[PDB]
Amino acid sequence: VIDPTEQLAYFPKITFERLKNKGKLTRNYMILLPWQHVNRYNFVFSSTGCKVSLKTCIGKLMKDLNPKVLYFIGEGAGNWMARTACEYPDIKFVYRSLKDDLDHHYPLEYQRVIGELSRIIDSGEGLSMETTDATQKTHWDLIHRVSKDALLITLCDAEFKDRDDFFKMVILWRKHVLSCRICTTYGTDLYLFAKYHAKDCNVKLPFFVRSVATFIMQGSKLSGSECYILLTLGHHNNLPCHGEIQNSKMKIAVCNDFYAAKKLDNKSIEANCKSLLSGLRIPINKKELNRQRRLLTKWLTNKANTIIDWLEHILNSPKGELNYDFFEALENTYPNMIKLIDNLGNAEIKKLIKVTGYMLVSKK
Ligand SMILES: [Zn+2]
Numbered sequence: 001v002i003d004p005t006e007q008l009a010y011f012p013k014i015t016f017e018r019l020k021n022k023g024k025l026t027r028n029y030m031i032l033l034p035w036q037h038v039n040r041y042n043f044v045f046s047s048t049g050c051k052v053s054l055k056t057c058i059g060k061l062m063k064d065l066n067p068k069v070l071y072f073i074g075e076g077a078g079n080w081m082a083r084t085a086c087e088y089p090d091i092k093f094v095y096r097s098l099k100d101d102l103d104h105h106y107p108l109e110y111q112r113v114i115g116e117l118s119r120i121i122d123s124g125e126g127l128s129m130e131t132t133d134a135t136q137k138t139h140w141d142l143i144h145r146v147s148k149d150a151l152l153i154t155l156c157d158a159e160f161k162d163r164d165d166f167f168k169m170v171i172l173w174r175k176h177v178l179s180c181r182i183c184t185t186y187g188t189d190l191y192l193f194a195k196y197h198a199k200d201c202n203v204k205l206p207f208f209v210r211s212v213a214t215f216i217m218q219g220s221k222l223s224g225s226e227c228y229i230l231l232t233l234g235h236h237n238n239l240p241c242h243g244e245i246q247n248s249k250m251k252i253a254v255c256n257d258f259y260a261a262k263k264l265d266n267k268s269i270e271a272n273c274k275s276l277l278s279g280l281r282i283p284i285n286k287k288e289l290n291r292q293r294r295l296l297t298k299w300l301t302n303k304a305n306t307i308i309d310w311l312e313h314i315l316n317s318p319k320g321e322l323n324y325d326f327f328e329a330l331e332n333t334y335p336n337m338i339k340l341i342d343n344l345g346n347a348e349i350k351k352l353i354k355v356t357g358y359m360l361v362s363k364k
Helices: 006-010 059-065 077-085 108-113 137-141 163-179 180-186 241-257 266-276 286-297 299-316 325-330 337-343 346-362
Strands: 015-022 071-072 092-096 121-122 153-156 191-197 209-217 226-233
Touching: 006 299, 059 153, 077 092, 077 108, 077 266, 092 137, 092 266, 137 163, 163 180, 163 191, 163 226, 209 241, 266 346, 286 299, 299 337, 299 346
Parallel strands: 071 092, 071 153, 092 121, 153 191
Antiparallel strands: 015 209, 191 226, 209 226
């Protein structure tokens, strides 16, 4: 009872830089908050699709290869997969994610965005911990238990402990696509679009693994050196160097603004509000914040005051454009910044930025 293409208007436009396979650009933004969640207010459990998209980044490859099935590894609640389902309404999916008590091993976001799970032909159900671990041979051995389609495009958004774990996955992918009866029959025109953290320089990829392009996303945490690398089979080359990623990341932060989503998913905004502060309603106005202050009259009451104080600061703050120059102003105009980051945890602060972004967009 849901049209996927209609749901796509809840996802924001993606700004990125492609580096196909020199002075330094530096700007020290005094920011302590995860501002990359500013345009992600319409999403609850996972929001990767606000940062990366197959139609925007690898649109041509999607058209040229025309895959019937897509293979997703490492997705939490499957928000990237959810965006893909909206962009490509006839594509079926194979989902894998580590069976942990830590992050989601089920696509909650996909179930929320897309109506049902009928297009997820393999959800990884019944599998053990090692058969869901991309750094283990058995995961790759059982990837074809339902889908008999070759791994034309494999999407990996897994967070690895170290680069050696990343190499374990990349080597296992190569070993699969060069052994597997299904995949070998298709050929060597097979791809792996994986998340990577460019820490070093001149780091060779495994034998017969070649990087086609590097993608630097506006939606990646400003502090790190995260990027998305498009790999294929062929004479090996180097992984992206930390220096290249920095200049690219900087230009996007200094030049570009975050696009807001064309439509506001009021159900999710209400959900993110109640998740941040129980009983918080929309519109978030002076009357709403004074009501929340009144309800308080402990550790939980301390966190609630911290939240209201920030929302009150955003409320009183002038309207600006969604960019890091304005975000730095927002932070360095608030007297209790250090008290905020100390009292609220990482998840609470990401929820706070989602709510903040909704408010900033709602202005004027
Ligand atoms: Zn295969």
